[PDB]
Amino acid sequence: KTLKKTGETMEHIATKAWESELGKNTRKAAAATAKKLDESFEPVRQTKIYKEVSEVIDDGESSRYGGFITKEQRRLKRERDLASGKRRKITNKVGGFFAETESSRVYSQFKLMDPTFSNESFTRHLREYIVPEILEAYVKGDVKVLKKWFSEAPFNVYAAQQKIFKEQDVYADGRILDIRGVEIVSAKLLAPQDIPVLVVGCRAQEINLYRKKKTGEIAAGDEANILMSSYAMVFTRDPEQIDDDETEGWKILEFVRGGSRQFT
Amino acid sequence: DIVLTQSPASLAVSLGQRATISCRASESVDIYGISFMNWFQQKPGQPPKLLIYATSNQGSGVPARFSGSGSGTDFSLNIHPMEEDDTAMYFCQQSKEVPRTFGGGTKLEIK
Amino acid sequence: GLIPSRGWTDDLCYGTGAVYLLGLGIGGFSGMMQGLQNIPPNSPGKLQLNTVLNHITKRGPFLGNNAGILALSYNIINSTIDALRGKHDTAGSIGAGALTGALFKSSKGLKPMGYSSAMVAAACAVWCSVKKRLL
Amino acid sequence: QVQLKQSGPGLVQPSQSLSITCTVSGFSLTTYGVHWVRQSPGKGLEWLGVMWRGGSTDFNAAFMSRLSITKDNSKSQVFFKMNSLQADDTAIYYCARYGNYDAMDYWGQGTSVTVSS
Amino acid sequence: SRDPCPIVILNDFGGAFAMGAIGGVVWHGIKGFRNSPLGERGSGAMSAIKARAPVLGGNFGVWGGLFSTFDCAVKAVRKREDPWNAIIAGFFTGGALAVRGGWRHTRNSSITCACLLGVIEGVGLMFQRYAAW
Ligand SMILES: CCCCCCCCCCCCCCCCCCCC(=O)O[C@H](COC(=O)CCCCCCCCCCCCCC)COP(=O)(O)OCCN
């Protein structure tokens, strides 16, 4: 109980320091200087070199290390890209290294569907659009998005679960705070038809809480209870309907959530 | 199990026009929304040659004039424009469940 | 003086460690400032800490890992050209840095070569002046 | 490239056994599987059994008591065998490698088998 | 042999980062080669190396660097060269890197790392005794 008591005292001291007249004035003074500095360098940012230099340093792979892309900012980035961009014994063993494997068959199939497909190209699309879109819809109970993305089997599991929440008169309003480790874990063939699938894993920080529909009070979870969940998705691409605006052929066959633990 | 009925049992069309072969399955052949219907061509003295797999995908080296369509229980194969070479026996084969079953075959000829 | 340099491995180890720590420190501080400006209003105490820490642990490792890779490539290249030339000079350091920048953005294209190579070579130029001044 | 060779005897005596060896080349039996398909003129193409990519077999329910499909990874060979044959078992027997979406993409030359005396 | 302890901290970030990055070059160069399609095996290795090797170098770099940082902190206070310095240093470096997972996660990662260094210290002491014979 000492740790809980210390946390309240530490929060109270920080709150008192933040709410202190000197602290509030100091915080306001620091904020004002930062705003002026950004405005001062704003014309510098307008220079074509700054875009050239920033794209050199950042380039957008900083998203590998975390960060959640807001739904609105997620749509504009995809729309803008779509408008312009997206529009002896050793030798025998060494030979077996270069030989065709099951993962080689899976990636080759997806390359016929889309000549631009690659492990690094799809992982960027997963990291930037697909995973944030699905995870945000999953925690917020957005069945309209999941209907397009999920297959018949995982969606019927989701709709069955969301049905239970209806007779409890509760609705899900969760948040995704940060998505990490978005990667293609494995590429396997689904027996016995050898359906090529991509197993995708990710780790996301989230707040899972439910509110009563009629009033809005808390019914489950907590307003401030961050969890480090692990999500496992199995992806396949339909050779047909690859011209879909939203999913462009991708379809989730399995969606598993596990390994949730507290985080901060 | 899954009985594939293929129509017509015979066909004769002139060069340059479109030849349509239909396959109708007793059940649905969908897994995960993908229809596992394959189309084969067999010349009289040769093994069957795969044309279409997963209902719409050209086999390796298959000319683009072969097209697969359909979903659910109704499937079709279209040859257009027809050439002199592609006169053969055409089969539809499902792969949803064992046993794999073939259609009756459609003899497709020239006028 | 400090930073023993008896062999090429110490330069590789000390150079990578010092530059990587500067990447963590600069990225961590840059992320901390960015996180403060991105705290949602009327947020509880735990999320305010979480929001800042998510930016520190995103921008910090991003800069630290990228600066560490440049230090590895530079120190391997700088030691390589030193073996061939048989002598280490400030001119060699700039060339090692300039070639390091090009290798960093090899797949981006020809225009990013100059921006990357100039910045890394400039970093070596600042480092050489700092190295001479302190030592 | 990929190429399947069959080595089986024609003119099998009635109530005897037919054995066909499908020697594959250009791919490994570990990463690909082989179907076994029959083509009678009075019954058309019909599927007998499959040597799955994983290494298990599955047979037609009408032939399960007679079929026997085994493979050998080292020699790249698939072995087919029917215990008893009658007049209606006269057909050409194909071994077909299957790929993604169970596409029988490569076929053997076929083994024309006659059951007579 | 070893340089003065307060300065070798910089050395052990760079030594651990180099092992992680080079270790991730071979590990993910092979892994990217295995995954990518038939005609893109070379590109898959380079893409896997560029994307993931720096990340692995940071993971090794911060673990080795923090372990060294606490090792000097332990030695500067304990004033010994006792082989239990690495046990305490390993105990604190596991807890520091797992601080966000909570109190129970921090404790479990501290004990796991301290025990893991216990195995390493034990193997070393067995190794020298056998060579002594
Ligand atoms: C996206 C990147 C973001 C980076 C953000 C952080 C940037 C930090 C820049 C720091 C610049 C000053 C570097 C100070 C390093 C202190 C090293 C102390 C130990 C030491 O002497 O190591 C030296 C190596 O240093 C070195 O290798 C340092 C010089 C080379 C630095 C290259 C990396 C920094 C690049 C910054 C621009 C990034 C451009 C991105 C496109 C030894 O070497 P020696 O000279 O004695 O060797 C002789 C032959 N053995």
Way the structure was solved: cryo-EM
Ligand 1 centroid – CA E13 distance (Å): 14
CA pair distance A95, D39, nearest whole angstrom: 38
Tell me: do E49 and E103 sit in the same domain: no
CA pair distance C33, C60, nearest whole angstrom: 12
Q: Of E63, E120, E52, E119, give the one whose Cα is nearest residue E92.
A: E63
Ligand 1 contacts CB of residue C71 (under 6 A): yes
Domain coverage including residue A46: 2-59
Ligand 1 centroid – CA C126 distance (Å): 9
Q: Edge to edge, what strands does the sheet with D18-25 contain?
A: D3-7, D18-25, D77-82, D67-72
CA pair distance C7, A109, nearest whole angstrom: 50
CATH number of A229's domain: 3.10.450.240
Q: Of D12, D111, D94, D8, give the one whose Cα is nearest residue D48.
A: D94
Alpha helices in A150-217 (DSSP H): 152-167
**Residue matched to tokens 């760079």:** E14
Are A and D neighbours with ≥3 CB pairs closer than 8 A? yes
CA pair distance D64, D82, nearest whole angstrom: 9
* E strand or H helix that includes residue B71: strand B66-71
Ligand 1 atom index nearest CA of C11? 42
Distance of CA A195 to the CA centre of its chain: 25
Contacts 24+ apart (CB under 8 A), A1-4: A3/E103
Question: Under 8 Å CB-to-CB from A94, ≥6 apart: which residues?
Answer: none
Q: Where are the domains of chain B?
A: 4-110
| D67 phi/psi in degrees, rounded to 5 | -75, 155
CA dihedral of B98, B104, B110, B111, whole degrees rounded to 10: -150
Question: Under 8 Å CB-to-CB from A58, ≥6 apart: which residues?
Answer: none
- Measured CA to CA in angstroms, residue E12 lies from A209, E19, E61, E117 at distances of 44, 10, 7, 17
**Is the CB of C54 less than 8 angstroms away from the CB of A59?**
no
Find the discontinuities in chain B where C to next N exceeds 2.5 angstroms and give the residue preceding each. none
Question: Under 8 Å CB-to-CB from C128, ≥6 apart: which residues?
Answer: C90, C93, C94
User: Which residue does chain E place closest to C23, by CA atoms?
Assistant: E58
Domain annotation for chain D: domains and CATH numbers: 3-110 (2.60.40.10)
CA pair distance B73, B75, nearest whole angstrom: 7
Ligand 1 centroid – CA C28 distance (Å): 18
- Look at residue C3 and tell me if it is in a domain: no
Give the single-character DSSP code of A182: E
Q: Of B48, B32, B28, B31, give the one whose Cα is nearest residue B40.
A: B48
Contact E74, E88 (CB under 8 A): yes
Ligand 1 contacts CB of residue C23 (under 6 A): yes
Q: Of A264, A252, A244, A223, give the one whose Cα is nearest residue A133.
A: A252
- Look at residue A66 and tell me if it is in a domain: no
Ligand 1 contacts CB of residue C102 (under 6 A): no
Give how many domains chain E has, as a whole number.
2
Contacts 24+ apart (CB under 8 A), A115-121: A118/E36, A118/E40, A118/E43, A118/E44, A118/E47, A119/A184, A119/E32, A119/E35, A119/E36, A119/E44, A119/E47, A119/E48, A120/E44, A120/E47, A120/E48, A120/E51
Ligand 1 contacts CB of residue C98 (under 6 A): no
Ligand 1 centroid – CA C77 distance (Å): 13
Q: In b/e form, how buried is each residue of D65-96, taking b as 16+ CB within 10 angstroms?
A: ebbebebeeeebbbebebeebeeebbbbbbbb
Question: Under 8 Å CB-to-CB from A161, ≥6 apart: which residues?
Answer: none
Give the single-character DSSP code of E45: H
CA pair distance C24, C96, nearest whole angstrom: 23
**Residue matched to tokens 């079709």:** B76
Tell me: do A99 and A16 sit in the same domain: no
Tell me: do C16 and C28 sit in the same domain: yes
User: What single string gives the DSSP state of each residue in A84-110?
Assistant: II---HHHHHHHHHHS--HHHHHHHHH
Domain coverage including residue E24: 1-81
Number of residues that make up chain E = 133
Tell me: do C94 and C79 sit in the same domain: no
CA pair distance E34, A104, nearest whole angstrom: 7
CA pair distance A264, C46, nearest whole angstrom: 7
Ligand 1 atom index nearest CA of C93? 45
CATH 3.60.21.10 fits B4-110, yes or no: no
Question: CB-hemisphere CA count at 13 Å for E121?
Answer: 15
Parallel/antiparallel/unpaired status of strands B34-35 and B30-31 = antiparallel
Burial class of residue D113, CB neighbours in 10 A (0-12, 13-18, 19+): buried
Ligand 1 contacts CB of residue C118 (under 6 A): no
Token pair recorded at residue E119: 């195995």
CA pair distance E33, E18, nearest whole angstrom: 22
Residue nearest to atom 20 of ligand 1 (CA): C15
Mutation site, C12, C14, C22, C55, interface E, largest E CB count within 10 A? C14
User: What single string gives the DSSP state of each residue in chain C?
Assistant: --S--SSHHHHHHHHHHHHHHHHHHHHHHHHHHHHHTTPPTT--HHHHHHHHHHHHHHHHHHHHHHHHHHHHHHHHHHHHHHHHHSS--HHHHHHHHHHHHHHHTTTT-SHHHHHHHHHHHHHHHHHHHHHHHH-
Question: Under 8 Å CB-to-CB from C91, ≥6 apart: which residues?
Answer: none
